[PDB]
Amino acid sequence: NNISKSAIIKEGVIIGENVTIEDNVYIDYGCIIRDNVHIKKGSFIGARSILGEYLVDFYNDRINKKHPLIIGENALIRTENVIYGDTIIGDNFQTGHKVTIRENTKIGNNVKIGTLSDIQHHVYIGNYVNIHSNVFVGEKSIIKDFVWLFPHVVLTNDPTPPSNELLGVTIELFAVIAARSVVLPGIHINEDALVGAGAVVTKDVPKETVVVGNPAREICSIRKIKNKITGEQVYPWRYTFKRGMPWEETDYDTWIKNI
Amino acid sequence: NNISKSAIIKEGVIIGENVTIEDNVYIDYGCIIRDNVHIKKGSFIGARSILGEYLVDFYNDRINKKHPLIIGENALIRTENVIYGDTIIGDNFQTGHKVTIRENTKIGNNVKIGTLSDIQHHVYIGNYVNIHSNVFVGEKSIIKDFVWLFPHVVLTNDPTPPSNELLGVTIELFAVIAARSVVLPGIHINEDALVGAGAVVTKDVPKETVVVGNPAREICSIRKIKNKITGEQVYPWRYTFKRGMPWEETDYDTWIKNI
Amino acid sequence: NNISKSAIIKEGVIIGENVTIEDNVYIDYGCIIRDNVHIKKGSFIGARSILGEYLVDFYNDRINKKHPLIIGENALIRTENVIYGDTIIGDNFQTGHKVTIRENTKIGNNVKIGTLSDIQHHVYIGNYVNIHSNVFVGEKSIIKDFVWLFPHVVLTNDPTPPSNELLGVTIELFAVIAARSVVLPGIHINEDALVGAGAVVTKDVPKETVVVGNPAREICSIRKIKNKITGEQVYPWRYTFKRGMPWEETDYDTWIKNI
Ligand SMILES: CC(=O)SCCNC(=O)CCNC(=O)[C@H](O)C(C)(C)COP(=O)(O)OP(=O)(O)OC[C@H]1O[C@@H](n2cnc3c(N)ncnc32)[C@H](O)[C@@H]1OP(=O)(O)O
Ligand SMILES: CC(=O)SCCNC(=O)CCNC(=O)[C@H](O)C(C)(C)COP(=O)(O)OP(=O)(O)OC[C@H]1O[C@@H](n2cnc3c(N)ncnc32)[C@H](O)[C@@H]1OP(=O)(O)O
Ligand SMILES: CC(=O)SCCNC(=O)CCNC(=O)[C@H](O)C(C)(C)COP(=O)(O)OP(=O)(O)OC[C@H]1O[C@@H](n2cnc3c(N)ncnc32)[C@H](O)[C@@H]1OP(=O)(O)O
Ligand SMILES: Cc1c[nH]c(=O)[nH]c1=O
Ligand SMILES: Cc1c[nH]c(=O)[nH]c1=O
Ligand SMILES: Cc1c[nH]c(=O)[nH]c1=O
């Protein structure tokens, strides 16, 4: 292995082989770090998380194959997160409790995944994505930057289940999926779209449109929505909300000009 | 610390500083009791629960600030519950497995919180409240006494997400929210109201009214409902159901006269 | 006890009394095997699972009564599964992470139960049943062979809650319940029926019928559905899908003739 002298590793932690733990990493009580896990500098790993969780091939003969997991700098992973090998997570990642993340998945930078979320295999999550509590992200889903998935959202992938050909959902830049919504397989939710709470999204959602209901139907442009408190137009949200965003200290327009 | 000689503390338990464990408390295998936790007499804490879980300020410098957690007498907390500091829980509390309860939250007496439920910060839960499996209780929610939240209910708080001003849901005395229902931000669900399974509640619900659907619509008075088995009028439920309630040994009317 | 010399039992495992662990069983780090647990040959038990979890009577006096749990051969149970006593699980069972299974429950052979699922007490699950992530299975539910419950499905049982007389849902052979659907108490979902994603099923569903919506309504025969990719008729699914099924190596028709 390769573990930093500044790493703090609490009681009960179990470490395997070919593990690299960088500087100022703190691994809380009881974590099990399985083989082929690389934890980048400054990260915190919550108690009893299990990192480099076994892929299916392990069970053939109980011999652990090599499926490297890398976690980026400064993660803040909370308790009992389970993360599979063959997955890459970027920097400043943060989680709630008991989150599960499968293999062959890629998660960008400054992403947040709340308590109980279940991210499946072969999932793509871009940067500054915010997934709240108990969100199910099915295999093949593609979540672009700045997307928000609120509690209990479920992204499906088998159009006529059970079947052999899956179609993942693709969620474009800044789209917001409100709580307890379910999206059907292969659906494209376009930029700056808003899917209202509890919707059953059976059709693509056009850019800057609001849909609600079961099945969800277009109700209006996102720009029509007013703040319930202040009466100000809310969307695109990038102009009215910036806590934790990269243009927090400036403004979106100046920010975007720079990138 | 201050731990009772009658307390039973199983193998693997980890105890921090400024912890008080009263008489006849039983802490099962592997719990991690973090600093500033007070567990009242006669309580049972399920294996691997983590009590006094770290608030956000801890991560600034990995130095644990003081945020006291108090749990009342006779709790029956099941496995792997995670409970934050700056929270108060009353007596005879009981939980299912893997429940998460955040900080700055207040939970009354004789409350039950089922498996997987995720109770956020700044939540108020009164007495004799029954929250079932995997219920999401958002920040700012106010749940009055005798309310029932059935499996997979979700109480939201950001009316035009993501935004800066949250509005919590308030659920009044005895109201019942059936399974897989979602309530929108700032909604008032009045006394003895019934929200039918799977509803999307977008408007306040008047006292003793039944609403169902997406969006939920008023269908009738609660008093119209008949028991599917016995044909007897069911509601107000306080008159037809009393298992585990304070008037269990008497009757509601005599009971209420006394308080 | 009775533990096989070929059993592999990792660090931190806690074993009680009257436990039988057969040949080639592998119990991962930190499992707690409570009294009266029988694990059949060749099974794998994921880290930190808790087997023979305490029934309610234990809490009367903290004295553990006898409530035997049996798990069949070749199980592949993943991490942190919690399984109660007075329950029987058949062979080739497999689970995802953090699944909870209560007492007085019977689970057949070649069944799969995904991450977070919460199976209550007095539940019957037949063979080759596939329950996905975070499915709630209420007390009294009866799930026949080959049924599929997709993510976030919830089967209820109190028709006018809270009440004293529960009615479980019965799901017949091969029926498929798509994601985020909720079924009301006492509902009969017949053979080869399809409940579309996110439905609120308030009425029995006839054999080979598709229902969708809130409340769910019949839309067509299952045989009308075409594969979204190939345009081939999909259902009965037993003729178009067989990965992991008993007729995988042959065909359903020849297979059924033999049984
Ligand atoms: C979990 C957390 O921590 S916070 C979760 C984040 N927030 C959420 O999930 C909820 C966010 N809010 C929503 O999703 C809302 O549904 C919105 C913003 C889309 C609703 O848009 P609104 O500003 O309420 O438009 P408005 O309420 O004036 O339009 C209401 C009409 O459409 C209906 N409607 C509004 N929202 C919905 C909905 N989600 N589903 C079905 N119908 C709806 C209303 O009942 C009303 O019908 P009416 O014509 O009979 O009066
Ligand atoms: C998880 C556990 O352990 S138990 C969970 C606790 N129980 C539950 O969550 C379910 C409780 N039951 C409900 O919520 C029910 O929906 C009730 C009690 C509100 C339904 O009231 P009912 O007594 O069924 O009235 P009833 O069924 O006669 O009225 C039915 C009409 O309204 C419709 N309807 C009834 N309930 C709903 C619903 N939840 N959503 C949408 N429509 C509904 C029916 O389909 C029917 O429509 P129709 O006019 O075409 O026939
Ligand atoms: C989580 C995982 O890993 S995968 C989860 C497994 N897969 C799922 O849960 C989703 C499976 N798919 C479904 O359940 C679908 O709803 C199906 C297959 C029942 C839909 O049948 P379809 O083949 O899409 O029929 P189709 O789409 O042509 O009929 C669509 C019409 O009914 C409506 N409709 C279709 N499905 C639904 C639904 N679930 N709820 C409400 N309305 C629906 C459509 O909006 C459309 O309405 P329209 O007349 O205005 O055009
Ligand atoms: C800030 C915060 C986010 N998510 C959590 O799970 N806990 C916290 O304290
Ligand atoms: C009675 C009971 C309630 N809740 C649980 O999680 N387990 C139990 O045994
Ligand atoms: C194949 C598979 C199924 N379910 C899981 O939880 N993990 C896996 O690797």
Report chain C residues whose CB lies below 8 A from the CB of B150.
Answer: 156, 158, 161
Nearest atom in ligand 5 to the alpha carbon of residue C84 is 9
- Tracing tokens 């929250």 back to the chain, one arrives at B131
Torsion angle (degrees, nearest 10) of CA A63, C38, B94, B86: -30
Burial (CB < 10 A; 0-12, 13-18, 19+), residue C62, is: exposed
| A164·C241 Cβ contact <8 A | yes
Cβ pair A195, A177 in contact under 8 A: yes
Q: How far, in Å, CA of A118 to CA of A81, rounded? A: 10
Indicate the SS3 state at residue C189.
strand
B188 Cα–ligand 1 center, Å: 15
DSSP B166-199: ----EE-TT-EE-TT-EE-TT-EE-TT-EE-TT-
For atom 49 of ligand 1, which residue has the closest CA? B215
For the range C62-69, what are the long-range contacts, defined as Cβ-Cβ under 8 Å and sequence gap of 24 or more? C62/B8, C62/B26, C62/B44, C64/C16, C64/C34, C64/C35, C66/C18, C66/C35, C66/C36, C67/C36, C67/C103, C68/C36, C68/C37, C68/C38, C69/C36, C69/C37, C69/C38
For residue A50, what are the β-bridge partners?
A32, A82
Tell me which DSSP letter residue C69 carries: E
Burial (CB < 10 A; 0-12, 13-18, 19+), residue A62, is: exposed
Is B2 annotated as contributing to ligand binding? no
- The amino acid present at B52, given as its one-letter code, is G
Cβ pair A117, A155 in contact under 8 A: no
Identity of the residue in B12, B62, B182 whose CB atom sits nearest the CB atom of A198: B182
Residue C58 sits at the vertex; the CA angle it makes with C53 and C60, to the nearest 5 degrees, is 155
Torsion sign, CA atoms B237, B240, B242, B246: positive
Residue C152 sits at the vertex; the CA angle it makes with A237 and A178, to the nearest 5 degrees, is 10
Indicate the SS3 state at residue B102.
coil
Tell me which DSSP letter residue C55 carries: P
Residue B100: nearest ligand to its CA? 4
The residues, any chain, with a CB within 8 Å of residue C28's CB and separated by 6 or more, are: C10, C13, C44, C45, C46, C47, C48, C49, C79
Nearest atom in ligand 1 to the alpha carbon of residue A181 is 9
**How are strands ordered across the β-sheet holding A124-125?**
A2-3, A19-21, A37-39, A69-71, A87-89, A106-107, A124-125, A142-143, A170-171, A188-189
Q: How far, in Å, CA of C146 to CA of C107, rounded? A: 12
Identity of the residue in C30, C118, C182 whose CB atom sits nearest the CB atom of B180: C182
Indicate the SS3 state at residue C257.
helix
- The amino acid present at C40, given as its one-letter code, is K
- Tracing tokens 């700012």 back to the chain, one arrives at B140
Q: How many CB atoms lie under 10 A from the CB of residue A116? A: 29
Solving technique: X-ray
Task: List residues in chain C that are followed by a break over 2.5 Å (C to N).
Answer: none
**Choosing among B103, B121, B136, B149, which should be mutated to test the A contact, i.e. which has the most A CBs within 10 A?**
B136
Cβ pair C177, C159 in contact under 8 A: no
Parallel/antiparallel/unpaired status of strands A14-15 and A32-33: parallel
CATH number for the domain whose boundaries are B1-221:
2.160.10.10
| C182·B176 Cβ contact <8 A | no
DSSP A34-81: -SSEEE-TT-EE-TT-EEEEPPTTHHHHT------EEE-TT-EE-TT-
The residues, any chain, with a CB within 8 Å of residue B76's CB and separated by 6 or more, are: B43, B44, B92, B93, B94, B95, C59
Is B197 annotated as contributing to ligand binding? yes
Parallel/antiparallel/unpaired status of strands A217-221 and A209-212: antiparallel
Parallel/antiparallel/unpaired status of strands B2-3 and B8-9: unpaired
For the range B192-201, what are the long-range contacts, defined as Cβ-Cβ under 8 Å and sequence gap of 24 or more? B192/B222, B192/B235, B192/B236, B192/B237, B193/B222, B194/B222, B194/B225, B194/B235, B197/B150, B197/C156, B197/C182, B197/C184, B197/C200, B198/C182, B198/C200, B198/C214, B200/A180, B200/A197, B200/A198, B200/A213, B200/A214, B200/C214
Tell how far CA A236 is from the center of its chain: 22
Q: How far, in Å, CA of A37 to CA of A86, rounded? A: 10
A113 Cα–ligand 4 center, Å: 10
Q: How many CB atoms lie under 10 A from the CB of residue A102? A: 24
DSSP B33-57: E-SSEEE-TT-EE-TT-EEEEPPTT
Beta strands in C30-86 (DSSP E): 32-33, 37-39, 44-45, 50-53, 69-71, 76-77, 82-84
Nearest partner of B50 among A79, C97, A45, judged by Cα:
A79
Nearest chain C CA: its distance from B210 CA (Å):
11
- The amino acid present at C221, given as its one-letter code, is S
Q: How far, in Å, CA of C175 to CA of A54, rounded? A: 32
**How is domain B222-259 classified at the CATH fold level?**
Ubiquitin Ligase Nedd4; Chain: W; (6.20.70)
Identity of the residue in A158, A163, A214 whose CB atom sits nearest the CB atom of C198: A214
Contact C156 CB / ligand 6 (< 6 Å) = no
φ, ψ for residue C126 (rounded to 5)?
-75, -150
A96 Cα–ligand 4 center, Å: 6
Q: How far, in Å, CA of B248 to CA of A42, rounded? A: 55
For residue B200, what are the β-bridge partners?
B182
Q: How far, in Å, CA of B187 to CA of B154, rounded? A: 12
| A179·B182 Cβ contact <8 A | yes
Give CA separation, C118 vs B98, B104, C99, C137, in Å: 11, 28, 6, 6
Q: Collect all residues from C whose CB is shorter than 8 A from any CB in B.
A: 12, 14, 30, 32, 48, 50, 53, 59, 62, 80, 82, 98, 100, 116, 118, 134, 136, 138, 152, 154, 156, 158-165, 167, 180, 182, 184-186, 200, 214-215
Give CA separation, B26 vs A91, B8, C251, in Å: 40, 5, 56
Parallel/antiparallel/unpaired status of strands C200-201 and B130-131: unpaired
Nearest partner of A33 among A106, A90, A86, A85, judged by Cα:
A85
| Token representation of residue B112 | 């039950």
Number of alpha carbons in the 13 Å side-chain half-sphere of residue C133: 22
Burial (CB < 10 A; 0-12, 13-18, 19+), residue C99, is: buried
Q: Which sequence spans correspond to the domains of chain B?
A: 1-221, 222-259
Query: Best substitution site from C78, C97, C135 to test ligand 6's pocket, by max atoms within 8 Å of Cβ?
Result: C78
Parallel/antiparallel/unpaired status of strands C50-53 and C32-33: parallel
H or E stretch at A258: helix A252-258
Contact C138 CB / ligand 6 (< 6 Å) = no
Cβ pair C23, C44 in contact under 8 A: no
Q: How many CB atoms lie under 10 A from the CB of residue A34? A: 25
Q: How far, in Å, CA of B44 to CA of C193, rounded? A: 45
| Token representation of residue B144 | 């009055």
| C186·B133 Cβ contact <8 A | no
Identity of the residue in A26, A133, A226 whose CB atom sits nearest the CB atom of B136: A133
Nearest atom in ligand 3 to the alpha carbon of residue C198 is 39
